[PDB]
């Protein structure tokens, strides 16, 4: 059995985040290592119980502009892109996103005969695609994509809301 307990619209990263690097940025594309700082995380999005089995599918709506080590680079602007992970509650469980179709980002699990929750996480890392007369790049709030729950092994959603969305909070790149 399943119930929805989280938020439909979700913001990724702190509002007006500031990100900077000492690294050279002469070998483009360059990826800021923002760790898990630019992310959303919530352990309690659906409440599940009684043998219910569920996983997660993810979908990124941004345009693919390249790839880096087996995952897509998504374009925000002509000079700024994103590496995106989606998956289970833990950021370390994040699945490297590629393409614009629904992809399994959490194989799943089943609750025993007790009550628990299904959570999720999303985090991105900024990528410098091309140089710019600024050195300070500014990105506005942008829609990213969605995550839906994936009931499996007989379990069903019914009319319970399955899908939640994500928006990138505006930030600034420095140095
Ligand atoms: C230890 O108690 C419960 O055990 C189950 C099964 O291992 C699971 O760990 C529970 O945590 C949930 O795990 C889900 C998948 O890993 C995750 O989506 C949920 O966010 C977790 N819910 C939590 C931590 O409250 C855990 O309750
Ligand atoms: Ni290095
Ligand atoms: Ni829905």
């Amino acid at each position: 059995v399943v119930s929805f307990i989280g938020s439909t619209e979700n913001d990724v990263g702190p509002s007006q985040g500031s990100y900077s690097s000492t690294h050279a940025m002469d070998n483009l594309p360059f990826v800021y290592n923002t760790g898990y700082n630019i992310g959303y995380q919530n352990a309690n999005v659906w409440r599940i119980g009684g043998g219910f089995c569920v996983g997660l599918d993810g979908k990124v709506d941004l345009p693919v502009v390249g790839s880096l080590d087996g995952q897509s680079i998504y374009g925000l602007t002509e000079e700024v892109g994103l590496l995106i992970w989606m998956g289970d509650t833990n950021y370390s469980r994040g699945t490297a996103m590629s393409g614009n179709s629904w992809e399994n980002v959490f194989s799943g699990w089943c609750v025993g005969n007790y009550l628990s929750t299904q959570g999720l996480s999303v985090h991105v890392r900024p990528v410098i695609l091309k140089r710019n007369s600024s050195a300070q790049y500014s990105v506005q709030k942008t829609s990213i994509g969605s995550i839906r729950m994936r009931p499996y092994n007989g379990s069903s959603a019914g009319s319970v809301q399955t899908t939640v969305n994500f928006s990138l909070n505006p930030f600034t790149l420095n140095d």
Side-chain angles (χ1 to χ4, degrees), residues 1-174:
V1 71
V2 62
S3 68
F4 177 63
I5 55 181
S7 305
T8 311
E9 303 301 327
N10 309 274
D11 295 340
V12 178
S15 182
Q16 305 303 337
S18 173
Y19 309 92
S20 313
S21 177
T22 305
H23 226 288
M25 308 163 187
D26 55 351
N27 270 3
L28 296 190
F30 172 76
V31 183
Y32 273 68
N33 180 42
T34 52
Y36 305 138
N37 297 291
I38 322 188
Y40 179 84
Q41 174 175 62
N42 188 5
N44 308 304
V45 181
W46 302 270
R47 174 166 271 115
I48 56 177
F52 197 85
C53 294
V54 71
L56 296 168
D57 296 339
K59 187 166 88 109
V60 182
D61 304 330
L62 295 169
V64 180
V65 301
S67 76
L68 185 271
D69 288 328
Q71 72 180 297
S72 291
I73 298 177
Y74 298 98
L76 293 180
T77 66
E78 298 165 88
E79 53 265 338
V80 176
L82 293 176
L83 296 178
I84 305 178
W85 289 260
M86 292 188 170
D88 196 32
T89 307
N90 293 340
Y91 283 116
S92 64
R93 303 270 202 92
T95 293
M97 294 310 289
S98 299
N100 300 116
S101 298
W102 290 100
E103 302 294 336
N104 178 33
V105 303
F106 173 49
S107 24
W109 73 296
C110 322
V111 275
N113 204 57
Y114 61 105
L115 288 169
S116 194
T117 53
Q118 175 55 38
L120 47 83
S121 76
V122 174
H123 66 97
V124 311
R125 291 173 211 222
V127 181
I128 310 297
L129 310 182
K130 66 186 303 181
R131 81 303 274 213
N132 184 242
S133 61
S134 292
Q136 168 149 332
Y137 312 79
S138 191
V139 166
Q140 268 68 49
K141 193 193 195 70
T142 303
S143 181
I144 292 177
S146 322
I147 287 186
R148 72 185 180 192
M149 64 163 169
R150 191 192 60 249
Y152 67 98
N153 180 251
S155 300
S156 186
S159 47
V160 177
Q161 174 183 347
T162 62
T163 306
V164 299
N165 305 322
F166 298 90
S167 290
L168 190 57
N169 251 359
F171 62 78
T172 306
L173 302 182
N174 306 276

